[PDB]
Amino acid sequence: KADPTLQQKISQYQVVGRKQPTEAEPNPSLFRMRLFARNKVLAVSKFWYLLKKMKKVKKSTGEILAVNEIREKRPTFVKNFGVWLRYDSRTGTHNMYKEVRDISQNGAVSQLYAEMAGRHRALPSNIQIIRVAEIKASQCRRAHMQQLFDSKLKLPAIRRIFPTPKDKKSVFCARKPTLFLH
């Protein structure tokens, strides 16, 4: 009943692996990382890829302990996110800082892969979102965020093209439609 179509199917996951015991080196140092992914499996894939860049570890030489799903605390109300990220253009790599507004962190990251692909043509494979912090209104530094802030904000509905539920739709009509609506 809840509409599948609006959002991407991102969920946030914590991951914790630890390399692997040896007779030289027993009890290693443990790791932790928050990741965004489709699934409980595909988080672990992305964990081992990212941990390979940091430290001399692999999926064969490593061992994973826990994959905790994380969600929002309170998803009812709207909040500002300052997303840090990197991506790979056809020249080279660039770090960015985007600012997105939605009810959830999952909703923000869904909205960002749309935005990032649409502008910069950045493929899903290249993007790696580094950290997604919650931000106060008096903190966002982007101008498109600032217009929205303030109580009593109003927005008039202009040019009302309605996506008719199917079956409602007919190929011919009589009257010609009315878009200003009022």
């Binding site: 093209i161 190929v171 011919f172 009509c173 009589a174 009257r175 010609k176 439609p177 878009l179």
Partner: protein, 200 residues
């Protein structure tokens, strides 16, 4: 699953978007008239579309251009081509579909009947505003369609003719709905509350 005839008003309409709806309905067996084809619209500016129509006039059979692509100047005849462009018209079935279609640039006959509107293929809906568009009546009179200002005169004549019809009808729409309010009182008080459930 369909009416006997369906007369289309073609003002406000986008040329391909209209034609693609109209094509599929001719194949399903519906008989169609198109009407006021001079006022039909196209996206892009007037200069842009006339430059595209000049690429069309450049085409001809070089051996004997009597034979080759017939460059049809009239708006009615232009719309007719793009509907035929969306049909397998060499096969026998495709030909039958064109037979159903009637296109006019408004005559007698079907001023008296109602004209419908395809809402999906419509400029106020589709073209995001500011984005420049072009009327086919302008584009045709640029390229040697002589009869612009008759289709001005005849329409302007039969709009005055129609507004005379309107004010008869509008007086006797009042007159029925006055006599409705008497008749709704005098029949018993149960059945008045019955109709106000279901709207009438």
């Amino acid at each position: 699953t369909f009416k006997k005839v369906v007369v289309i008003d073609c003002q406000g309409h986008l040329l391909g978007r209209l034609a693609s709806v109209v094509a599929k309905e001719l194949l399903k067996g519906q008989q169609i008239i198109c009407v006021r084809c001079e006022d039909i619209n196209i996206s892009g500016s007037l200069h842009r579309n006339r430059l595209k129509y000049q690429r069309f006039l450049r085409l001809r059979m070089n051996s004997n251009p009597r034979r080759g692509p017939y460059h049809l100047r009239a708006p009615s005849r232009i719309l007719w081509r793009t509907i035929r462009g969306m049909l397998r018209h060499k096969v026998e079935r495709g030909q039958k579909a064109l037979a159903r279609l009637q296109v006019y640039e408004v005559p007698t006959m079907v001023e008296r009947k109602k004209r419908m509107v395809v809402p999906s293929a419509l400029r106020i809906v589709r073209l995001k505003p500011k984005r420049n568009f072009c009327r086919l009546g302008d584009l045709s009179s640029q390229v040697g369609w002589s009869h612009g200002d008759l289709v001005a005169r005849l329409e302007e004549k039969r709009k005055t003719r129609s507004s005379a019809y309107y004010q008869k009808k509008k007086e006797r729409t009042k007159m029925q709905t006055e006599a409705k309010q008497f008749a709704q009182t005098t029949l018993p008080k149960d059945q008045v509350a019955f109709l106000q459930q279901y709207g009438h």
